């Protein structure tokens, strides 16, 4: 329960599984790097 769920291993009582072993995902996730552009350069004095 979320009430006894702080307290199971302060009262060092073993919590319950339910599952037999760990549900792991179907597929894997790809992570590709987040794309960076250098969009904008400006001048502070400047003719043009």
Do not use: D, G
């Not at 979320?2 to 009262?11: G, K, M």
């Not at 179907?26 to 590709?32: L, S």
């Amino acid at each position: 329960s979320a009430t006894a769920a702080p307290l199971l291993t302060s009262l060092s009582v073993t919590p319950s599984q339910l599952l037999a072993a760990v549900h792991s995902f179907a597929t894997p996730m790809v992570v590709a790097a987040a794309v960076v552009a250098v969009e904008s350069t400006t001048i502070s004095p400047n003719y043009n």
